[PDB]
Amino acid sequence: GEWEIIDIGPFTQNLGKFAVDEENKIGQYGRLTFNKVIRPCMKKTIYREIKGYEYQLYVRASDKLFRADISEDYKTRGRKLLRFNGPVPPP
Amino acid sequence: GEWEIIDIGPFTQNLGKFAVDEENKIGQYGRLTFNKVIRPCMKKTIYEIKGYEYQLYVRASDKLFRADISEDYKTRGRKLLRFNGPVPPP
């Protein structure tokens, strides 16, 4: 579909927690501690009717910046961590 | 500083060629070949306006890279701030 910039309020912060919680189960970067999702946060609506969303997030965790992609199902709110890249520099 | 999504028409494609041209002169990645700027493309306004930062995902040499370009509002001069890669799809 197309991308938009979205706010970094509670919903986005929970996406960040999700990413870090998924990454913690993988273990690839040791144990990360969620800090905050920072600007900018990008959302892609995937389609007359939405079927899914893709999020790109910059997450501060363990004082370092990471880039996370998350897919979400519109119908059942099912989330998958597609990518977790980092430590990346600031956007 | 408020970010916005911008489209990927000729202007953005030229920014991508600029990024690759700049990075080729820097040399960190050897000789890259510009392919395409892909969605999403982001632009941040830095404040009266001082200038802009563009974040572009640039395909070059079959690989995806993240490029940040600064532009000064008064001078209209651009700089390559970051060239990060290869990164996965955004």
UniProtKB/Swiss-Prot annotation, chain A:
What SUPFAM superfamilies does its record include? Cystatin/monellin
Which chain positions carry the site (Blocking, abolishes the sweet taste)? Answer: C41
**Practical applications:** Natural monellin has not been mass marketed to the food industry, primarily due to the challenge of large-scale purification of the protein which is relatively sensitive to heat or acid treatment.
Domain of life (superkingdom):
Eukaryota
InterPro entries the record matches: Cystatin_sf, Monellin, Monellin_B, Sweet-Taste_Mod_sf
Q: Does the keyword Transferase apply?
A: no
User: Which UniProt keyword terms apply here?
Assistant: Taste-modifying protein
One Pfam family hit:
Monellin
Q: Does the keyword Iron-sulfur apply?
A: no
Described function: Taste-modifying protein; intensely sweet-tasting protein.
Q: How does it assemble?
A: Heterodimer of an A chain and a B chain.
Protein's UniProt name: Monellin chain B
Organism annotation: Dioscoreophyllum cumminsii (Serendipity berry)
Swiss-Prot record, chain B:
Q: Which UniProt keywords apply?
A: Taste-modifying protein
Q: Which residues form the signal peptide?
A: none
- A Pfam family found in this protein is Monellin
Q: Which InterPro entries match?
A: Cystatin_sf (IPR046350), Monellin (IPR015283), Monellin_B (IPR002095), Sweet-Taste_Mod_sf (IPR053768)
Biotech use, in short, is:
Natural monellin has not been mass marketed to the food industry, primarily due to the challenge of large-scale purification of the protein which is relatively sensitive to heat or acid treatment.
Q: Where is this site: Blocking, abolishes the sweet taste?
A: C41
Organism, per UniProt? Dioscoreophyllum cumminsii (Serendipity berry)
Chain segments annotated as transmembrane: none
Q: What is this protein called?
A: Monellin chain B
Q: What does this protein do?
A: Taste-modifying protein; intensely sweet-tasting protein.
